[PDB]
């Protein structure tokens, strides 16, 4: 019966809690307590990219560490040459309520989506000189909150309906649908090998999915409120989440447990973008109080602040070669830091 | 200084910027509105009438263009979204106004409407956003009150002690009972609005029927007032 099934589920949940507690023998803070502090990290605004009419919700670096796509509520994507601040492309969108964007690893396509429930894909390199809509992927029943390219023919989308999907771009169809969340899925992060990916939703839980098999491997539950951002450690063995409870947390896949939380008493606004550095020694986190904090990812000591924005920081991206950090905010400016 | 291809790239960027200014002009000359309501509220009828008079299966947002006195308005309603609202409502914190349509002739779903209005009014991101509430379906309200079979006092006990305010303006000629009822519903909503506004945003009531052709004019007047107050703040006049 339903009561019997619920009792079995509760017993299994207690068993998983016990299994996690047994493997917890030394917190990460104890083992890191004898390594040198990072010291103060001063980052200076090197470039300021102007041109967006309205608030910026998402950005994504190119894999060449120089090109950069940005999405704003005015209804445009702009591809910037970060070194010279030139505008390479200006892509007008059909729906202005865009709130995610991705740059293909090959560099030929970009994707965007939002309240229209559609992950549109744009062909940057055509025989004609313009950018055209390659394909519109329809099938989500809620807003698209994140999109990440696996290659030029596969893309992973997380949506407002409690559901992620893996698409085939040539034939629009959803190849795999990942189900299991209870609230809106807000973020998404592909592993370095692009065989696994983690999604954080508004049920205050993050799940690691298997792209080929299609099933949820683990479920991580530590947060007190909804999860807004997620990113993999460059190792591929850990990920960091940023929530509305004004905290960031670092989970491990192998131990299946939360390692360290990044919180401060002065901070009461929610974190809305989270990214690592190349070494993973730094955890950069955006915030609603207009500023980005740079956390020493191994010791949970705030090492720096990136304070130059006049509105909330909505996106954050560390380049593939580690030279720069870009920050887009609701004041309609991006800023490249170094 | 910089090579020939770099100069040509800079010139391409400058042309992109000129197109961006052209887009900025039309972006700041159009006013964005968000339409909210329940299934029973005739917001679909409102949008259909506004589309007809003036000027894709799982799609999540619908857009409507309409123009009053050479001023452009964009009106978005959400089509395919889930029940939860706390995440996609942040996209609408720079709209000119929010249009909240409520069915005023139900009495069994009215408290749910007040709860939804309270959630909209007290939202963290929707501060400094004014609400144009349309107390819709006034004709059903009139018929229902005149029939007398369905009573309000059992749904809202406080209605008995309520009396019509002196500032009432029942225009066409109607029984005092329908006027008392409709001003009671309006006063419920306005109590919610004036409880915790703090003077940053206002609430504009309107008694409407779905057939009414004066809704676009009402929206235009309220938006004119909202921009007037915002300019008063911007130009350091208050």
């Amino acid at each position: 019966e339903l009561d019997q099934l619920r009792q079995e589920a509760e017993q299994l949940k207690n068993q998983i809690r016990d299994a996690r507690k047994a493997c917890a023998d030394a917190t990460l803070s104890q083992i890191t307590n004898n390594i040198d502090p990072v010291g103060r990290i001063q980052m200076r605004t090197r470039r300021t990219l102007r041109g967006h009419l309205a608030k910026i919700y998402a950005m994504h670096w190119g894999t060449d560490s120089r090109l950069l796509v940005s999405a704003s509520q005015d209804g445009k994507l702009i591809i910037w040459d970060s070194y010279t601040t030139n505008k390479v492309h200006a892509i007008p969108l059909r729906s202005s309520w865009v709130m995610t964007c991705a740059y293909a690893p090959s560099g030929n396509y970009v994707a965007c989506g939002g309240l229209d429930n559609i992950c549109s894909i744009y062909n940057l390199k055509t025989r004609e000189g313009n950018v055209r809509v390659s394909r519109e992927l329809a099938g989500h029943t809620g807003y698209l909150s994140c999109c990440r390219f696996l290659d030029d023919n596969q893309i992973v989308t997380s949506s407002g309906d409690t559901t992620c999907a893996l698409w085939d771009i040539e034939t629009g169809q959803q190849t795999t649908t990942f189900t299991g969340h209870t609230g809106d899925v807000m973020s998404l992060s592909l592993a370095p090998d692009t065989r696994l990916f983690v999604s954080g939703a508004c049920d205050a839980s993050a799940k690691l999915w298997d792209v080929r098999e299609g099933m949820c491997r683990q479920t991580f539950t530590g947060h007190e409120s909804d999860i807004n951002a997620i990113c993999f450690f460059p190792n591929g063995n850990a990920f960091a989440t940023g929530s509305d409870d004004a905290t960031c947390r670092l989970f491990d896949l192998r131990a299946d447990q939360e390692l360290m939380t990044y919180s401060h008493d002065n901070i009461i606004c929610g974190i809305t973008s989270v990214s690592f550095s190349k070494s993973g020694r730094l955890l950069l986190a955006g915030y609603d109080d207009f500023n980005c904090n740079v956390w020493d990812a191994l010791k949970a000591d705030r090492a720096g602040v990136l304070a130059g924005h006049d509105n909330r920081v909505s996106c954050l991206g560390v380049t593939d070669d580690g030279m720069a950090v870009a920050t887009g905010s609701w004041d309609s400016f991006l800023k490249i830091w170094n | 200084t910089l090579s020939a291809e770099d100069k040509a790239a800079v010139e391409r960027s400058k042309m992109i910027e000129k197109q961006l200014q052209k887009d900025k002009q039309v972006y700041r000359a159009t006013h964005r509105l968000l339409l909210l309501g329940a299934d029973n509220s005739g917001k679909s009828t409102i949008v259909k009438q506004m589309r007809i008079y003036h000027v894709v299966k799982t799609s999540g947002i619908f857009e409507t263009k309409f123009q009053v006195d050479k001023v452009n308005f964009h009106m978005f309603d959400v089509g395919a979204q889930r029940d939860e609202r706390r995440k996609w409502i942040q996209c609408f914190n720079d709209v000119t106004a929010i249009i909240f349509v409520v069915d005023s002739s139900d009495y069994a779903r009215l408290q749910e409407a007040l709860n939804d209005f309270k959630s909209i009014w007290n939202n963290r991101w929707l501060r400094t956003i004014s609400v144009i509430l349309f107390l819709n379906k006034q004709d059903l309200l009139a018929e229902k009150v005149l029939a007398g079979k369905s009573k309000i006092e059992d749904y809202f006990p406080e209605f008995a002690r309520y009396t019509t305010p002196e500032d009432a303006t029942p225009e066409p000629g109607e029984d005092p009972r329908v006027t008392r009822a409709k001003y009671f519903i309006r006063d419920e909503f306005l109590r919610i609005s004036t409880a915790s506004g703090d003077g940053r945003h206002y609430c504009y009531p309107h008694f409407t029927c779905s057939v009414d052709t004066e809704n676009a004019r009402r929206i235009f007047n309220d938006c004119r007032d909202i921009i007037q107050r915002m300019h008063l703040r911007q130009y350091e006049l208050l």
Partner: single-chain antibody
Amino acid sequence: VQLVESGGGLVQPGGSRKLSCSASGFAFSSFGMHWVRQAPEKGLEWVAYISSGSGTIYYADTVKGRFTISRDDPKNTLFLQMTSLRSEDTAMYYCVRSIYYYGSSPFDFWGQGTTLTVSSSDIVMTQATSSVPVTPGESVSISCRSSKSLLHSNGNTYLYWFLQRPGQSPQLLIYRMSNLASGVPDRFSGSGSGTAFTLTISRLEAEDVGVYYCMQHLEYPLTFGAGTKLE
């Protein structure tokens, strides 16, 4: 994509003649355009340049006040009004398409060309081997050299390689000494050092026979070089 231009013919000396270039199949208004000519049996020679948005116009010193370049974006055509045609203007004029942003490939499409006959401190590029014998199946190493270093402080060396089969117009093979253009097989590769450059065809096939021209884009005017003939 295609570019069809017209307006060439026998012109008495001292006359005038307008050449139009009708474009179709691509976003013309966002492409800079060039006019490139070659004398009846000589190499290519750059003539003029008009930018996207018509904001930059350049001419060769040999045609500076004589010719004028213009474009008509809504009608999607390109013009070259010419005045006082001397006898050194007998050539076949090519309409070339070029877009400039980070990573773009300029000079990627060339029109079929119009023949014109008239009755009776710039970088030099030299291609010394002015003929090469070759047989199907083996590897050739066409060479080129420069007067001024083509390497810029950016990191690019603006050297381009063009192939002209005995019939049709030139088609881009390599841009900025290392990048194969779209549609060119991986049999072609390029290298160089700043002043001396080479183009390697790994496994030559019967469609690679023609004349190979190089070109610099470091600064205007654009100079070419006589070109090596593969036979």
